[PDB]
Amino acid sequence: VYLDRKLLTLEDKELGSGNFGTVKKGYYQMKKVVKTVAVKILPALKDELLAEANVMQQLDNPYIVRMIGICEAESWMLVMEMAELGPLNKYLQQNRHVKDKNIIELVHQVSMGMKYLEESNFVHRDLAARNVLLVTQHYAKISDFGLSKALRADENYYKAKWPVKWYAPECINYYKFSSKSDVWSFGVLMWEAFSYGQKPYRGMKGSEVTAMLEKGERMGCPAGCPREMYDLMNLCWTYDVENRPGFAAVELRLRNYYYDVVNEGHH
Numbered sequence: 001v002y003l004d005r006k007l008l009t010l011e012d013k014e015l016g017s018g019n020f021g022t023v024k025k026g027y028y029q030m031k032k033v034v035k036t037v038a039v040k041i042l043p044a045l046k047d048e049l050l051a052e053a054n055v056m057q058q059l060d061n062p063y064i065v066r067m068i069g070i071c072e073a074e075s076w077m078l079v080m081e082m083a084e085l086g087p088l089n090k091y092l093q094q095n096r097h098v099k100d101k102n103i104i105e106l107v108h109q110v111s112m113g114m115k116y117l118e119e120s121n122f123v124h125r126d127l128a129a130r131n132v133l134l135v136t137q138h139y140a141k142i143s144d145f146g147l148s149k150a151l152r153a154d155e156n157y158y159k160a161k162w163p164v165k166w167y168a169p170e171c172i173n174y175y176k177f178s179s180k181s182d183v184w185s186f187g188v189l190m191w192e193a194f195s196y197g198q199k200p201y202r203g204m205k206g207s208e209v210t211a212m213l214e215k216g217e218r219m220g221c222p223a224g225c226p227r228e229m230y231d232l233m234n235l236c237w238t239y240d241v242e243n244r245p246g247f248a249a250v251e252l253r254l255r256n257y258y259y260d261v262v263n264e265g266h267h
C-alpha cells in the first residue's frame, strides 16, 4: 500500500482537480516495467485523502480506477491508474461525432462499476460525467472517491458544497445517501453523456432545481438520444427511493439495450 518515492517521477504539468487535491501525470517503476500513473497531490485535507485511499484500497473491478498506493513526500500523494483520454464530459464536448452506440457502451460500463460498488455496500456520492474517465474510446472507469462512504453493516444509507444538481430528493431533504441515490445521480450522468457533456439544469440555481422536481418535472430528452435510454434516465429519477431501481436492474436494462443496438447494427 505504501510506495517508494524514488521509484516515482512526477511531471511539473497538471491534469485537473477533484473534490480534494490536484492530479498530475507520473511514472512508477514496477517490478520490471514502468507504469504511467495519475497522482493526486495536496491538516484535515490529509485525513480525507487517506480516507479516500482507504476506500479505493477495498475496490477491485475493471470499471473502477484502481489505486496503486500512497506516498508521503513534499505532500501526501494518492497514486492511481492513468486514463489517458480523460473525463467523459470533456471528451464528448470535444468529440461530437461519437455515436450513440458508443455512448451506450460507456454508460453501461459505468453501470457495471456501480453494480459492483452497490454489491460492496459503498456509496459513491459524486457520480457525474466529470468523474468518469476514459482509458480508451471504448473503456470507461469510475473515479474520484473523495465523498465516498462505506456503509455500516446495519444501515442502508449514510447520513451526512454539494453537487446538488446530481443529488436525489432524499439527499436534499434528509441528508440520506444510499446506492439508490447513486442511481438518481447515474440518471443525470446518462443525460450528460447523451447531451455530449452539457451541464444539467442549465442556468438554474439549486433552489430552482428543487422547485422543478417537486412539480414532478424532469429534464427533457437530449437531441438524438434513444427513447429507451431516456426512459431509463426517467426511471433513475423516480422520486420515491423504494420504487427507484437498484444498479442490478439498471445494468441489465443497459446490457440488453446495448446488445439490441449492436446486433441491429449487423442488420
Ligand SMILES: CC(C)NC(=O)c1c[nH]c2ncc(-c3nn(C)c4cc(Cl)ccc34)nc12
Pocket (backbone or CB within 6 Å): 015, 016, 017, 018, 023, 038, 065, 080, 081, 082, 083, 084, 085, 086, 087, 130, 131, 133, 143, 144
Ligand atoms: C481529477 C480526478 C477526477 N481524476 C482522477 O482521479 C484520475 C485518476 N486517474 C486519472 N487519469 C487521468 C486523469 C485525467 N486525464 N486528463 C487529461 C484529465 C483532465 C482533467 Cl481536467 C481531469 C483529470 C484528467 N484523471 C485521473
